[PDB]
Design a binder for this molecule. Structure first.
Ligand code: BEF
Ligand SMILES: [Mn+2]
Length: 117
């Protein structure tokens, strides 16, 4: 399975990439919302892990535009942790929303759960 991870902070991207690689997934990375849409279109990932505070196009906008054409599972992963943030993330089309700082094991279990369903 192929995972697109979208995050502008390279240290975070690297941590998540390391963890997905350990699970046997193929990893693609994007570092802003424009790269996220371009990678989504070129790579057709099986799942997207999506940060929200991103250069160029923010993650909510990325999720909304992906949803215009695709039902690819989207797991938002953000320091934005308010009721409002989670609710609008899910309403716009995210299948799950996990906050930073996060457990690596839980992230792995949530990716598996989304892929399962
Ligand atoms: F920059 Be992410 F929304 F933590
Ligand atoms: Mn960010």
């Amino acid at each position: 399975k192929k995972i697109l991870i979208v995050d502008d902070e390279k240290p975070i991207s690297d941590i998540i990439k390391f963890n997905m690689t350990k699970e046997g997934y193929e990893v693609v990375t994007a570092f802003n919302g424009r790269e996220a849409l371009e990678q989504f279109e070129a790579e057709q990932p099986d799942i997207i892990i999506l940060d929200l505070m991103l250069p160029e196009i923010d993650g909510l906008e990325v999720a909304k535009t992906i949803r215009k054409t695709s039902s690819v599972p989207i797991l938002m992963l953000s320091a934005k942790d308010s009721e409002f943030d989670k609710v609008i993330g899910l309403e716009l089309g995210a299948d799950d929303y996990v906050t930073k700082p996060f457990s690596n094991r839980e992230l792995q279990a949530r990716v598996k759960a989304l892929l399962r369903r």
